[PDB]
Amino acid sequence: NFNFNGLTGTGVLTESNKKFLPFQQFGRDIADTTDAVRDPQTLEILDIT
């Protein structure tokens, strides 16, 4: 049950291969479902499956 800064969601986290632009915090799927986050302390992208 992860709580990134205001993204309180329940998922397994995976080591993504996505490249967010420097200011983009979390990824979003086609049907408005969160797919990925930037960990705010290590600027790496985790996918939420």
Partner 1 sequence: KFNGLTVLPPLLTDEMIAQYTSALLAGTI
Ligand X SMILES: *[C@@H]1O[C@H](CO)[C@@H](O)[C@H](O)[C@H]1NC(C)=O
Query: Can you give the binding site for ligand X, defined by CB under 6 A?
Result: 41-43
Residue nearer to partner 1 on the CB measure, 21 or 30: 30
How far apart are the C-alpha atoms of 38 and 44, rounded to whole Å?
6
3-state secondary structure of 18: coil
43 binds, among partner 1, ligand X, none (CB under 5 to 8 A by kind): ligand X
Work out which of 9, 33, 39, 44 binds partner 1, going by CB under 8 A.
33
41 binds, among partner 1, ligand X, none (CB under 5 to 8 A by kind): ligand X
How far apart are the C-alpha atoms of 7 and 34, rounded to whole Å?
9
Report the chain's terminal Cα–Cα distance, integer Å: 12
